[PDB]
Amino acid sequence: DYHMERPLLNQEHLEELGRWGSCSRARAYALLLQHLPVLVWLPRYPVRDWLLGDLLSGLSVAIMQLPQGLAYALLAGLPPVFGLYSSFYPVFIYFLFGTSRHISVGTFAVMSVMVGSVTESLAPQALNDSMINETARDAARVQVASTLSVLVGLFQVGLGLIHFGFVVTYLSEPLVRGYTTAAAVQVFVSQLKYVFGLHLSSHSGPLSLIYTVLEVCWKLPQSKVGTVVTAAVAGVVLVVVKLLNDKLQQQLPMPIPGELLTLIGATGISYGMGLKHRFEVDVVGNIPAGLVPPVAPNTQLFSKLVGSAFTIAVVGFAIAISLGKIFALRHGYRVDSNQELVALGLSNLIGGIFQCFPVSCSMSRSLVQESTGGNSQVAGAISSLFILLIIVKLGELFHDLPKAVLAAIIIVNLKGMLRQLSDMRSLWKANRADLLIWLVTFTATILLNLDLGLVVAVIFSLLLVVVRTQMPHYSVLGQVPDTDIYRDVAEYSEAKEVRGVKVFRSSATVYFANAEFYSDALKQRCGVDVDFLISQKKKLLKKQEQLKLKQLQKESTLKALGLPQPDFHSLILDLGALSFVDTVCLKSLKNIFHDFREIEVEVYMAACHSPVVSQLEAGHFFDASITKKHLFASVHDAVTFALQHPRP
Amino acid sequence: DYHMERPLLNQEHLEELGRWGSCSRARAYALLLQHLPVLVWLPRYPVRDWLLGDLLSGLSVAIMQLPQGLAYALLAGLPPVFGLYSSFYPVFIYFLFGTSRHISVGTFAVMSVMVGSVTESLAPQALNDSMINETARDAARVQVASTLSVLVGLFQVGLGLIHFGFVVTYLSEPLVRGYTTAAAVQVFVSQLKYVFGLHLSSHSGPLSLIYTVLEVCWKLPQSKVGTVVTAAVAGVVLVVVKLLNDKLQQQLPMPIPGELLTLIGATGISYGMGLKHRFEVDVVGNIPAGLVPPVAPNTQLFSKLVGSAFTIAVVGFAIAISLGKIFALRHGYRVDSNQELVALGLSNLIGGIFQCFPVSCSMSRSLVQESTGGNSQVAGAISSLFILLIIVKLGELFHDLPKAVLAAIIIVNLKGMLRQLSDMRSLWKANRADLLIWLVTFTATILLNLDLGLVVAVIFSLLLVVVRTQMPHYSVLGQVPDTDIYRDVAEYSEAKEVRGVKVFRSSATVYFANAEFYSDALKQRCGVDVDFLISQKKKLLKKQEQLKLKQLQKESTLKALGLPQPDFHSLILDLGALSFVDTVCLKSLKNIFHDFREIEVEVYMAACHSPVVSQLEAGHFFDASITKKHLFASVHDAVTFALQHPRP
Ligand SMILES: [Cl-]
Ligand SMILES: [Cl-]
């Protein structure tokens, strides 16, 4: 029920009744600890409870990373061996600075395709010169990837130190989903070349995808039969193994190493059949064994990469955060965004120093790590060690691995991103603005490539956020019978408007973008054309003044001038959605007050929160003409005051 | 007073008590009339009342436009004669499609400097070749200016037809003020070359202003004494005349033609002293007499100009609208933004066809037109006719006009834009966000030039709008004694929080940018670390389940598990500032509900407006778990329900 009986309360009354009023060691060890979680979570590691699970999880993660690293290195354009380096250099670094215990840092399809586009831009493939140009191009691509990794790591470390871990919140879920779907489309188009076996020119810039698809279609009859057969067999095997594992996941504690088995079988078949020599099927080539000494980044490329560097960084960070947060909700721990950004930046920087390319976290790999029984980053560290073994001696065993098979892996690794079209269609029933953002991001990333596409998508998202506040549901409120609740009359038929009092509510805040829109909507839906009546009144007053001046040389009420008096004697604004009052909002409010006082209508402001009143006071909004007694706290209070003060 | 007694009302009750519920001839003539205001305002023109005033106003406007056109043509890099063409071609066109009576369309400093930058970019000044290269460069600059005018006119007409007259509202007042101040600085730096007489290379791209200033300082000792003396004398005369006119404006019905008198005196003195031959003072040159036949735009430049075309268009439109609206408030008529955009676009297009450069409206010229007694666009048309006379025969009289004098005019014509630094300093007391936008726009336009500077300023303004919603005044509300008004406790000391009930209000809307921020702020200021308590509860429940499973193999309340029970039994959200509910907002609300129901706290939503409920219903927010009875209409109603339903 309700029994609230009180005297009428304005802003001044409300203030009267509410009494308005306005290092060294310890930190040296807190900052060090928060920068290095390892010192806090490794000493308290339960060996008996988690060792075996972490060992099995790391074994599975390494098993899955061995073919994924090579495939994504091939996607990036680099020789496959460097991919393994990723699976070994950032990961261990993430073991030291990482806060998420259930994500595996490594090669991601989107990051790999972004690095591949960069390498193609700064090192196009040329068919004129074959062997020595190929070696020089591989070296140049490796240097470009290392410099890009160094720059991305520096950007991420800098953003993390300034605690700019909230930059991900600008990337809404529809935008990220569209970007990932377009990245999957890009990856499929790029891998079509390796699946068919065609030789194609390196396209770059806008509309690269369309040109690549057209060239693939044009050169399709030249596709090698053996390469297509091998790619189809590899894809069929991968699909069958993945479906089998999904359909009896409960029986087997760990997923079947389908990708590793496919890679081993392809290598064995190619060795036993001489595919490269006989059927001219492309192979990965020679994989060096050992650790490459660190190489300093080439600063001369900093101008070329920076525009495509920061973007990549952000994208990776975004994905990383998402995974961590998801696993956070699955294990009841907090993942610090800033520390995650710092860890990823340090991993990328150390990789770039040690001949690597930018890395991120993989969803399928993280899910496998969780399922196998992982509970800490130690598992991931174990994975790195296994990759180290592959780097040390088991690297030349994959000399005769068919190349297309790797491409096939990536094609079978884009299931979720292409599944997101289901989400795309589902957005047609929940929010069409999200669907518009999704389609704009998808089209921009397809046409203007990923680097510009993300910028265009972010700018369009911000513009649509601004536009959404420029299209609010203006409501001429009315009183629900025998209540104090005021709701839209056009929506609630039973609601009846108060006689002589109008209440106008805007669902969105009134700032510089929609201040004029708010004023025009108020004047349009107020029932009286305020501008026309004010102009008439001014003209009539000027004519009367001229007549008086002429009479003197020879020798204000609306009813007096014959103008139609508005039905409502008072107007009440419901600025409950108002957040901040800037200069334009204050100007609009003053203009509304002056215009309605000229038409002999007193304006009352109702439901203003704490910051609005303070900002109005600071902006010199209040004066003798506009006192604080008009700034009522509740709409019904203002309606009661207006009914108690009707002008004669 | 208050006497509102009613049963408790939820969303379902409120719906029950409010009954929630969801060409040819004439047109064609209406469209023709609204596109051509002339057919409506010329036939009803009062000859006796307004003819003489319009004639005098047009005479004054032409008097002021004669030197201003030449000065701004010199600023744009074109030969001065083409400037006069502007004062004759767009203006008359604006007489046909114009809706504002009290603004004069012509050459503006910002538009002129933007055209000059474009011409310098597409036709750099070369000192190696002197005469024939000068003629070819002048022809190329004229073609570039004509093509730019055509493209700007097409852009403006297209925007007006789609009724995109609200694109100006993105340009806030601080942004426009900073852009104009930086344009004035640009103009002063550019005119320093003509004032001193130095020969300088054509700088372009970012940091052009700094390089130009450094080169001027480096070559300062080579400045000609005669040119500096003439410029100083012209500036002193202009300042004296302007101050005299301002200080006795009431006595003289029309302003003293200071600029025209200065131009005539400079021409006479140069003729009578042989400044060009003896003192080597620069002169304007030869002014052709007659009308240039129309020249089709060169489409091959469309790629180069488009990036700098649209920008210019918008800027001009912005200024135009402002002036019109101001004069609207001074004469009680409505100026249609779309029709103004169409008129300006048609004027620019016809000028570009007829060898002209983009035009806008001038504030000082419009003020002089208003003061002299103008009441219609006919006055402006009269101005064009006078300029026509100057184009016909009185064009070769200005052969020996000193060039620096024209530059001096522009320097004395930047008084308001440089005065805006007073506004800049005044922004330090009203709104520091506006000051930040002003400084960012000023610096960006100074360094990265006007074309990129405007884009950077707009992007930063949108980003700061988004950020402003990410920093809201989260408030833990409390009840003002013996009232129903709930206000911030940290701000109002007397306000007391309800025992067992918490109210949380965010001043800004909850959307994808600040949804996580809103949830984290709620959990932080709710007095209980929700995440830690939920994680403990989950761990304790899992341990108990494991113990039960072990017991079975061998053979929910917070108080039961020993966890600390929160002081508040219910939580009430005050989403009065919520405008639209997208997918991320719905996910955040569902997560808040689930998390607080796990901690045994029931969440109630209060003060939701019309669109919020509809969007929640459309998004499948409501289900069996979350009924519509929790969506209370008033905060006090929800508090009463929570107090009437405390769990045992
Ligand atoms: Cl993946
Ligand atoms: Cl001006």
Author numbering:
A (entry chain B), B (entry chain A): 28 to 49, 62 to 594, 655 to 747
List passages from the publication reporting this PDB structure:
Here we have determined the structure of the closely related human transporter SLC26A6 and characterized it as a coupled exchanger of chloride with bicarbonate and presumably also oxalate. We also attempted to follow electrogenic Cl-/oxalate exchange by patch clamp electrophysiology in the whole cell configuration but did not measure pronounced currents that would be above background, likely due to the slow kinetics of the process. Together, our functional experiments characterize SLC26A6 as a strictly coupled transporter that exchanges Cl- with HCO3- and presumably also oxalate at a 1:1 stoichiometric ratio.
The structure defines an inward-facing conformation of the protein that generally resembles known structures of SLC26A9. In the homodimeric protein, subunit interactions are predominantly formed by the domain-swapped cytoplasmic parts including an extended N-terminal region and the C-terminal STAS domain, whereas the few contacts between the transmembrane transport units are confined to the end of the terminal membrane-spanning helix α14. The substrate binding site located in the center of the core domain is accessible from the cytoplasm via a spacious aqueous cavity, whereas the extracellular exit is sealed by extended contacts between core and gate domains. The presumable location of a bound chloride ion is resolved in the structure of SLC26A6 at a low contour of the map. In the density, the N-terminal part of the IVS folds into an α-helix encompassing amino acids 569–593 (CαIVS) whereas the following 61 residues are unstructured and thus not resolved in the density.
